[PDB]
Amino acid sequence: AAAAAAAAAAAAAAAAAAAAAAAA
Amino acid sequence: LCKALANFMFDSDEAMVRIDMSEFMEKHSVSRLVGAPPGYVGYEEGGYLTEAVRRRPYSVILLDAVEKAHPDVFNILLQVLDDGRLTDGQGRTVDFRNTVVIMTSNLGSDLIQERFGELDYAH
Structure with a gap:
């Protein structure tokens, strides 16, 4: 008589980063 | 002379x-x-x-x-020569209180080659 435990289920994401440029 | 200071x-x-x-x-x-x-x-x-x-x-x-x-x-x-301070792009100060700044040129080289003889060091 076991009961299936609901989980925590850790997740993930990321993030870029642009870069402008001078144009001499 | 600069390499001599570095070697010293x-x-x-x-x-x-x-x-x-x-x-x-x-x-x-x-x-x-x-x-x-x-x-x-x-x-x-x-x-x-x-x-x-x-x-x-x-x-x-x-x-x-x-x-x-x-x-x-x-x-x-x-x-740099006021305080030894310099602030890079991230914005933190960098202490130059233990540095030696040497600048060389050849500005009056004609004048030095002309008048190092018959003249004092001072004038």
């Missing part, structure tokens, strides 16, 4: 930082040695001169061929 101080000629200012004949290479602001390209790297101090602050900073560059590179060294 550090037992090696190239245990130092030489940055030859003939490479900086344009203005904007100020950003090469002090870095680039937040937003722009080389932000996460720092200026070359500031990082090279920030590792080993007791060192010798050599500038050679100082007549080659643009005249307004030398607000950076106004900061």
